[PDB]
Amino acid sequence: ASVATAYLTLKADQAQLQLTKDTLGTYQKSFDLTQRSYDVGVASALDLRQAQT
Amino acid sequence: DQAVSKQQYADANAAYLQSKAAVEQARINLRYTKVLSPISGRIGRSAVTEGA
């Protein structure tokens, strides 16, 4: 029972690690879109800081 | 970069063209108040003088 629970929590943590990596990718795409929209002056230095956080 | 989509560019471009049309109307009204000859020829005298 213990080795079954350990293998299943290993698979679950690898799956949600992959999902967290995909959310990091989408957040990085949001950040460099906001950085592109910050240099020319559409977005101020508040939405850029929110995307950075 | 497709961070602000095409519709929010299209209405801004429409506002830009409407402002160009308003400035062209005002440039016509300021091209008047210096009344130009419509055609070229020998001119008569001023009916109203400087000040009327």
Side-chain angles (χ1 to χ4, degrees), chain A residues 21-41:
Chain A
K21 188 181 265 78
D22 290 332
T23 59
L24 184 272
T26 62
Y27 281 160
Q28 186 67 42
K29 186 65 183 292
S30 179
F31 180 71
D32 64 0
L33 287 179
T34 309
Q35 186 67 40
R36 182 68 179 89
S37 180
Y38 174 73
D39 292 331
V40 299

Side-chain angles (χ1 to χ4, degrees), chain A residues 37-50:
Chain A
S37 180
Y38 174 73
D39 292 331
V40 299
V42 176
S44 66
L46 278 73
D47 292 331
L48 197 280
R49 298 291 189 266
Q50 291 177 356

Side-chain angles (χ1 to χ4, degrees), chain B residues 1 5 7 10 12-13 15-16 20 22 25-26 28 30-33 36-38 40-42 44-46 49 51:
Chain B
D1 201 7
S5 291
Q7 182 64 39
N13 198 4
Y16 168 66
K20 286 182 74 69
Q25 283 288 111
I28 289 168
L30 197 144
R31 185 181 63 84
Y32 299 115
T33 68
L36 301 173
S37 292
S40 67
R42 186 180 294 274
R45 67 183 184 271
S46 65
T49 327

Side-chain angles (χ1 to χ4, degrees), chain B residues 2-16:
Chain B
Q2 201 61 251
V4 177
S5 291
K6 295 179 180 180
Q7 182 64 39
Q8 196 174 1
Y9 173 70
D11 60 355
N13 198 4
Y16 168 66

